[PDB]
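step 4 of 6: structure.
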Amino acid sequence: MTTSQKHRDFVAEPMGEKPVGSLAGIGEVLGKKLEERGFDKAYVVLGQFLVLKKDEDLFREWLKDTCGANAKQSRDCFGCLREWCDAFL
Amino acid sequence: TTSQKHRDFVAEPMGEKPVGSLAGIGEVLGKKLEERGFDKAYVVLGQFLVLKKDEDLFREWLKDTCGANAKQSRDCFGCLREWCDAFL
């Protein structure tokens, strides 16, 4: 296992109303910027991931443009949503 | 009241189900959604989620996007809402 514990905790169960900061790669700084843009719950970011048809390039670019995420942060967030979807969607 | 199509959709994860598996989305609406990029049910779920599950805005978006009437958009909203309550 090379993922974080935080990734593993997110992908282990339905997300319900978890805040956006429950996503791997989304620390307090990125989480506040996402909340200020209306992406306050993790499921709203899931929504964007799905509207983009789970495309890595589009989602990771969107995250960068929306909250300033760097490459590692955006990879971690994408991977957490991708594995959650494989488990639950 | 619900259709069997609704109950079949809300009973299980949607995976890669086509957009036409959603209650309310018949052959005509489905084609118009596919033409606009919403080829899978989960892409419409995505829009429902981006809109924070807001009934008025989602049903209006669906009217604007594929011409859904009030019953079709009612049916589609209700199946996504109940799916999310079971699985999200």
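step 5 of 6: annotate
 - Residues 71-88 of chain A form the longest helix (18 residues).
 - The interface with chain B takes residues 14-16, 38, 41, 43-44, 46-53, 85, 88-89 of chain A (CB under 8 Å).
step 6 of 6: archive
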